[PDB]
Design an enzyme around this catalytic site. Structure first.
Site, PDB file in Angstrom:
ATOM      1  N   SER A 187       3.184   3.416   2.329  1.00  0.00           N
ATOM      2  CA  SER A 187       3.592   2.361   1.409  1.00  0.00           C
ATOM      3  C   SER A 187       4.726   2.749   0.458  1.00  0.00           C
ATOM      4  CB  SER A 187       2.378   1.903   0.588  1.00  0.00           C
ATOM      5  OG  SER A 187       1.938   2.916  -0.305  1.00  0.00           O
ATOM      6  N   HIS A 215      -1.260  -2.163   4.816  1.00  0.00           N
ATOM      7  CA  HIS A 215       0.086  -2.714   4.797  1.00  0.00           C
ATOM      8  C   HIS A 215       0.577  -3.111   6.184  1.00  0.00           C
ATOM      9  CE1 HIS A 215       1.700  -2.068   0.621  1.00  0.00           C
ATOM     10  NE2 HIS A 215       0.562  -1.402   0.549  1.00  0.00           N
ATOM     11  N   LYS A 246      -3.452  -8.120   0.979  1.00  0.00           N
ATOM     12  CA  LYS A 246      -2.050  -7.973   1.341  1.00  0.00           C
ATOM     13  C   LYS A 246      -1.588  -9.223   2.079  1.00  0.00           C
ATOM     14  CE  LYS A 246      -1.863  -3.676  -0.133  1.00  0.00           C
ATOM     15  NZ  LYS A 246      -2.740  -3.217  -1.248  1.00  0.00           N
TER      16      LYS A 246
END
Ligand SMILES: Cc1ncc(COP(=O)(O)O)c(C=O)c1O
Ligand SMILES: Cc1ncc(COP(=O)(O)O)c(C=O)c1O
Lengths: 400, 400
Positions: A187, A215, A246
């Site tokens: 990330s 992610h 997310k």
């Protein structure tokens, strides 16, 4: 109390030192919904380029209507843990849906991926076992391994040579079970982990594989199942953790997916699962609706990838140094920490919301500004942002 | 694969061992909303006496409509942490509302009280400091202390003498800061902690006080602020942790409340606060509505306490041995583990849902069935339950 005066004084001193070192994190109050155009408390609208709203589902009307429907059909909260009287039919429905979406046998739901990672390693691995983690894993993984009594080994980021060396050291240490933990997408660099090499080394040394696709899930891959579909290494990755905060909506919740034996042992022994409230019915209904919506159209994914390619091309042309490859996270490498802070400030003056990161989170002097693409951005807003970025880069004597 | 098979096989062995001891936790699917009458998948309605829905707010229509209003005004999710772009105006509104409701200077929100306890001790106390815990503290507190590098001390339950001994041992050990952690209500005995004696010992030895009022906030006290209002020891208790998954609704979320310096240091350094998604707008709006609703009428508290007094009196008359005092948790002490299991089975046959607990959670042979009162129970349903309990007690040769 009495002595409290000294205690709080020490805290204040530490806080002031954080302000002196330029690391004080301040929260900016938002008055609007989570979308591409966000209203701050000062009245200004700004383009948001630092939220994990990759698919723009945080304000999607279908998810809002599904959450209202869930609150009407199954209530607001459970007020109990899962094994007592907090397990509804929608919980198992979402679990089966996630297991089929990710291609695993079973899943188990938590109120956050933080607790999902925290309640996994200690539940599975004893002192005889060993954990081999990428040096740049997320903080939740680090704390979860800290709760595990297994042998701990780390290897530098994406260095498969050090990974093999640590595997050899684990075998020589007499480890019963060996687990390789890694993020699917790092990330802070926007780079996808080398899953094929990891799986090959795992089969060579007989080790289990865990991937944190927080992610990644939602858009990475053909169906958006995650990086295990990106590298086509399903059935070779044993355990997959993930979140719903997310791309999969943006509310809260986490999950762990794998074979039924592991998931049963988690339902029987995972401490966050036993001593924390069940997942709210609104979030569960909305997540089921998310899975359906992602099965109905790959339009948002195509929009996101078009935005990412356009951003990367236009920013690489202007002389910016960009990191990462093939992901919605594009970091602008600036080098110095003060440069990153001033860049964020100036871009905020131009109406763009970005965030920079320096020493304690990324090496010095590899300071960067992590821009995050989103399927909610239109090329009008994208081009306005990119133009503002090039203006700031020219004003700061960065690009010429 | 191969080593995967051996791993899952050993896990299956462990699961089978858990089944052999009669400790396999099985989840019962619920098809209705969370209320006094719950429908299982077999079609039966049962009276729930094992949920933390003390005030009945889990299905309160005002909370459902307020959650819909919050989802319409501020969206479904934030898709970001608080210090990036996940802090809305409603978050700070709920924080000030909770700080005034609990009588503290500031509060900080988490997605669960588990993370609130996990992110407190490591953030505040170093190796120079010391923690003194009640031997019967919750698992979240235990995991939070496990992450702390401070000196660890235990004292047996409610034993203020051992507490003073450990305070002396901590002062003699050269501890800089000393923190005493305790639950406000011990969730297996229905007993409120001896907060006045703890505060007196803390003032004598100059120590900080932390109370986990998860099973107390909402109804314990005059306004329902918690056990610190029960014993009138506000301003004498330094830090208060709590959840919203009990009486305050039953969805999810947690908080830590204290002086503004500590809360700032937590916003800067608490790992679950920095690396976990912000709280969803629906839950925040519903919690604000909860605080308002609890300030608008003390009817639900009066219903809960009337139910509790009626239950305790009528069950004490029938010859049952009840534990606890002045709380909605009333344990029926049965002694033998097989007796508690059979009692739960029979009461489920009578249409009452209860849960018993034996050795690894409560001492042997002090097996008990933890009944939990609720403002959603009516004296019709309450008396039906008590009749079923007395029937089971007569059938099992317990009460005569
Ligand atoms: C890899 C990873 N795991 C977990 C989280 C946080 O998960 P959650 O929002 O459920 O607390 C994040 C953010 C993350 O990047
Ligand atoms: C003392 C205590 N802390 C924390 C929790 C769990 O909190 P949460 O539901 O927010 O995860 C429980 C239940 C509890 O009894």
């Amino acid at each position: 109390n009495i002595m409290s005066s000294a205690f709080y004084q020490q805290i204040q001193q530490q806080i002031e030192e954080v302000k002196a070192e330029g690391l004080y994190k301040s929260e900016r109050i938002i008055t609007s919904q989570q979308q591409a155009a966000v209203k701050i408390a000062s009245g200004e609208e700004v383009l948001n380029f630092c939220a994990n709203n990759y698919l723009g589902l945080a304000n999607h009307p279908a998810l809002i209507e599904a959450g209202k429907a869930g609150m009407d059909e199954h209530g607001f909260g459970m007020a109990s843990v899962r094994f007592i009287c907090g397990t509804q039919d929608i919980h198992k429905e979402l679990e089966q849906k996630l297991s089929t979406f990710l291609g695993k046998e079973d899943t188990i739901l938590y109120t956050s991926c933080f607790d999902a990672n925290a309640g996994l390693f200690e539940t599975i691995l004893d002192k005889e076992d060993a954990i081999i983690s990428d040096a740049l894993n997320h903080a939740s993984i680090i704390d979860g391994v800290r709760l595990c009594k297994a042998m701990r080994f780390r290897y530098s980021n994406n260095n498969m040579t050090e990974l093999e060396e640590q595997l050899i050291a684990a075998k020589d240490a007499g480890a019963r079970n060996i687990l390789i933990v890694t993020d699917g997408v790092f990330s802070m660099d926007g780079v996808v982990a080398n899953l094929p090499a990891i799986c090959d080394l795992a089969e060579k040394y007989g080790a289990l594989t865990m991937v944190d696709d927080s992610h990644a899930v939602g858009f990475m891959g053909k169906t958006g199942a995650g990086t295990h579909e990106y590298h086509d290494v399903v059935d070779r990755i044993d355990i997959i953790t993930g979140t719903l905060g997310k791309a999969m909506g943006g509310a809260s919740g986490g999950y762990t997916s794998g074979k039924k034996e592991v998931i049963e042992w988690l339902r029987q022994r995972s401490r966050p699962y036993l001593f924390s409230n069940s997942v709210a019915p609104a979030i569960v209904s909305a997540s089921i609706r998310v899975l359906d919506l992602l099965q109905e159209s790959g339009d948002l994914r195509d929009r996101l990838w078009e935005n990412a390619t356009h951003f990367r091309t236009r920013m690489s042309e202007a002389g910016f140094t960009l990191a990462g490859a093939d992901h919605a996270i594009i970091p602008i490498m600036l080098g110095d920490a003060k440069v990153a802070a001033e860049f964020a400030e100036r871009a905020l003056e131009k109406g763009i919301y970005v965030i920079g990161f320096s020493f304690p989170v990324v090496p010095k002097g590899q300071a960067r500004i992590r821009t995050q693409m989103s399927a909610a951005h239109s090329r009008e807003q994208l081009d306005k942002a990119i133009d503002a970025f090039i203006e700031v880069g020219r004003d700061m004597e960065i690009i010429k």
